Amino acid sequence: LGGYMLGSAMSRPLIHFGNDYEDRYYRENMYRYPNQVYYRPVDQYSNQNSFVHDCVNITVKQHTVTTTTKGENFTETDIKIMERVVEQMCVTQYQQESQAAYQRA
Numbered sequence: 001l002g003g004y005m006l007g008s009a010m011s012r013p014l015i016h017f018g019n020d021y022e023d024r025y026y027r028e029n030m031y032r033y034p035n036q037v038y039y040r041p042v043d044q045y046s047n048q049n050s051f052v053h054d055c056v057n058i059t060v061k062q063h064t065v066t067t068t069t070k071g072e073n074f075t076e077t078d079i080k081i082m083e084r085v086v087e088q089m090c091v092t093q094y095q096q097e098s099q100a101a102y103q104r105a
Contacts, residue, residue: 003040004058007093010035015085026081032072033082034063037090043098052090059086 012030017023039055060083068074 001038001058001062004038004055005040007037007039007055007090007097010089010093012085013089013092015081015088022077022081025077026085029078029081030085032068033060033074033078034067034086035089037086037093038062039090039093039097041097041100042094043101048091048094049087052094053083053087055090056083056087059090 012035015026017026019025036059037052037055038058039051042051045051060079064074064082068078072078
C-alpha cells in the first residue's frame with residue numbers, strides 16, 4: 001500500500017439493488033465498508049478487475065478488518081455490497097485516474 005494511493009474517498013457512487021435489506025445494507029455499508037479504495041495511479045496498466053477489483057481486495061481489507069471488526073455483522077451479503085461499491089468505484093476511478101492522467105499529464 002506504498003504505491004496504493006487512496007483512490008478517492010468518494011461519497012458513495014449511488015449503487016442500489018432495488019432492494020430493502022441488501023439495498024439499505026449497501027446504503028449504510030458505505031460507512032461501515034467505506035466509500036474509498038486503495039490503489040496507485042493507473043491508466044497504462046490496461047487491467048480493470050485485475051487492478052481495480054484487486055484495489056478493493058485491499059480496501060475491503062484495510063477497513064473491514066478494523067472498521068468492520070469494531071462490532072459489525074458482516075455476512076456474505078455484507079461483503080458484496082462493499083466490494084461491489086468500492087470495486088466499481090475503483091473502476092470509475094480507473095477511467096477517472098486514466099483521464100486524471102489527462103489532467104496532470
